Amino acid sequence: FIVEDDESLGHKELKVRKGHIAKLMATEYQDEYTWSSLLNEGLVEYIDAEEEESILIAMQPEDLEPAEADVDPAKRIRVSHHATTFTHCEIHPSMILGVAASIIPFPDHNQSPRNTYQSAMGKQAMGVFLTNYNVRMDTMANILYYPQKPLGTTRAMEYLKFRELPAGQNAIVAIACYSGY
Amino acid sequence: TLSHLRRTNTPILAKPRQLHNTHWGLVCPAETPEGQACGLVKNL
C-alpha cells in the first residue's frame, strides 16, 4: 500500500480509501474494478527486495497512523506508529506466510519450529486433491471418505480453497490420561 | 499441490540455510524441510 502524505486535510495517509474498497466489493458481488486498477491508479505498488531497503512500512494501516491522545489486558502488546516517514503499508502481515503455513490456526501462538513441522506434515495428509479423481489413472491416490472443513480457519485459506477441498476432520478430542494407552 | 508449485531450490552449513531479514514478505519463514536441505529449499 502507498502512504504518500498527500493529505492536505491532515497527516500522511494511505492512497487507497473506503470508497476504492467498497468499489472493489462491488465487482466481487457481481459473481470491473480489478487489481490492475488499484495498481495503475497508483494505489499499491510492487516493491522488490532491493527497493525495500529504502522505504518505511507500517503494519496495521490503522493503529500505525492516527494521533495519540484504557488498553485491553487480554490482547497482546504491540509497539507503535513511532513515525511519519511511512512511505508504504503492509496489505496484511499474515501474508508473509506461504501456502503450507497459511493453514496453521493461531501460528502466532506456537513455538516457531512447531509451525515448521505442521508445514511439512500437512503434505502427508489425505483429502480430496481434485474433484476429478474419479476420472484419473494416477498410480496411487487417497481420498478421504467424509471430508469436513475445519472449525477454526484462516482468512488466508479462502484463497487456498481449503474449505472446498479439506484434508481432515473435526474430531471431538479429549486430553486425558485414560487407559494409559 | 499448491505448495509444490511455489517451491524453490538453492543448489550449493550456516549463512545460506538461515532465515534472512531480506526474506521478509518474499519467502515463508516457517515452511522449509528438516535436516539435509534445510533452509536451502524455500517456499514463496
Binding site: V16, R17, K18, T34, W35 | -
Partner: peptide
C-alpha cells in the same frame, strides 16, 4: 465518503482482488 480512511478488515477485500486476478500460481505461468 468515498475517500474516508480504511481499517483492518478492509485489507482483505484488496487481498481478494489480488488473487482474483493473479491466482495462486501466477509466477509459473507468467
Amino acid at each position: 465518503d468515498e475517500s474516508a480512511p480504511i481499517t483492518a478488515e478492509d485489507s482483505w477485500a484488496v487481498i481478494s482482488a489480488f488473487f482474483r486476478e493473479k491466482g495462486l500460481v501466477s509466477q509459473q505461468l507468467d
